[PDB]
Paper text:
We incorporated (S)–2-amino-4,4-dimethylpentanoic acid (C3) into the backbone sequences of D4, D10, and D19 replacing leucine at position 4, yielding peptides D7, D12, and D20, respectively. As expected, the structure–activity relationship (SAR) held true between all peptides, whereby incorporation of the unnatural amino acid increased the binding affinity over 6-fold versus the respective parental peptide. We attempted these soaking experiments with our four highest affinity peptides, D21, D20, D7, and D19 (in order of highest affinity to lowest) and were able to observe sufficient ligand density for all but D19. The crystal structures of Cdc20WD40 in complex with each of the other three D-box peptides show that they bound to Cdc20WD40 at the canonical D-box degron binding site, with a largely similar topology to the S. cerevisiae Acm1-Cdh1 structure (overlay of D21 with Acm1 D-box). The nitrogen backbone atom of the (S)–2-amino-4,4,4-trifluorobutanoic acid/(S)–2-amino-4,4-dimethylpentanoic acid unnatural amino acids also forms a hydrogen bond with the carbonyl of Asp177. All peptides form a hydrogen bond between the carbonyl of A2 to the amine of G5/S5. Interestingly, the observed electron density of the peptide correlates with Cdc20 binding affinity: D21 and D20, having the highest affinities, display the clearest electron density allowing six amino acids to be modelled, whereas D7 shows relatively poor density permitting modelling of only four residues. We then explored whether the D-box peptides at a fixed concentration stabilise the Cdc20, and for D7, D20, and D21 we observed increases in the thermal stability of Cdc20 that correlated with their binding affinities as previously determined.
Here we explore peptide inhibitors of Cdc20, a substrate-recognition subunit and activator of the E3 ubiquitin ligase the anaphase-promoting complex/cyclosome (APC/C) that is essential in mitosis and consequently of interest as an anti-cancer target. APC/C engages substrates via degrons that include the ‘destruction box’ (D-box) motif. The D-box binding site comprises a cleft between two of the beta-propeller blades and the neighbouring APC/C subunit APC10, which is thought to result in stabilisation of the active complex. We used a rational design approach to construct binders containing unnatural amino acids aimed at better filling a hydrophobic pocket that contributes to the D-box binding site on the surface of Cdc20.
Numbering used by the authors:
A (entry chain A): 168 to 340, 344 to 474
B (entry chain B): 2 to 5
Amino acid sequence: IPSLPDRILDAPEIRNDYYLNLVDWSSGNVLAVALDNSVYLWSASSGDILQLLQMEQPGEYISSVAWIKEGNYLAVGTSSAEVQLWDVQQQKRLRNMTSHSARVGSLSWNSYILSSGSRSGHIHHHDVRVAEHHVATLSGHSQEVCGLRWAPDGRHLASGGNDNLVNVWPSAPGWVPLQTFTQHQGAVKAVAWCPWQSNVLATGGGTSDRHIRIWNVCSGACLSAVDAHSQVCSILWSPHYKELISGHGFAQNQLVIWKYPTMAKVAELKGHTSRVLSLTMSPDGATVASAAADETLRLWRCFE
Amino acid sequence: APXG
């Protein structure tokens, strides 16, 4: 595992707000990076950069980005409670979806259904193909929904909040969680499903929790609870190595690679000078981009 | 330069 990233991209004006999900790597190998009020696209193949959009009103900022599975549309959540849908090949906003009462800090796609999480605590399902996009409201959080992730098989949706809860929702309704994990003693932003085990979920808590928890969402069992000694902003699973990677803050501002299922520490990726905000994985699974409050995106080819 |  290389101790240095393969690339370092400048991320000037990246919002140092823990609850936002400002980066996402598309299946088309394009990294979407939200920098204050703009979204930049960076093609990992050509290095071409495109300023896709800029918010039009003063005080507006991007609070989340998420690529649809095919990588041709980008969802962008805003501080003005909008969930915009951008066609990145046309470089045009197809939709400006309103329904939320507060910023949309988290997003996750399940086919044509886009789920959005808000600072209000609500999650909305949006059928982006239809006029009345708002087809469901999932209300299981009383504070900001900062983690939102559909399972790769679409059978469950996980959400983590600033109310220290993890909810595991069904894919259809009523709309009540199948599981509500209260064991994290801090905000739950890190939420990632095991790619090779349908019901296995990894979650990570903030500064007052510092733990990575592995769950079986069917039995509700906590399979593992590991102290990372720092806030856990993000978790990713490598489908190739059978490992997890987590991003952290004070004091080391590092990424940790853990062996699964033993949860043994494999490596620490040091380099960021301020807290890591988000991790995102390349489509091939080889590279992890970490966005940090030090205004850089470090691209670690740690799984190749 | 953003992302440079």
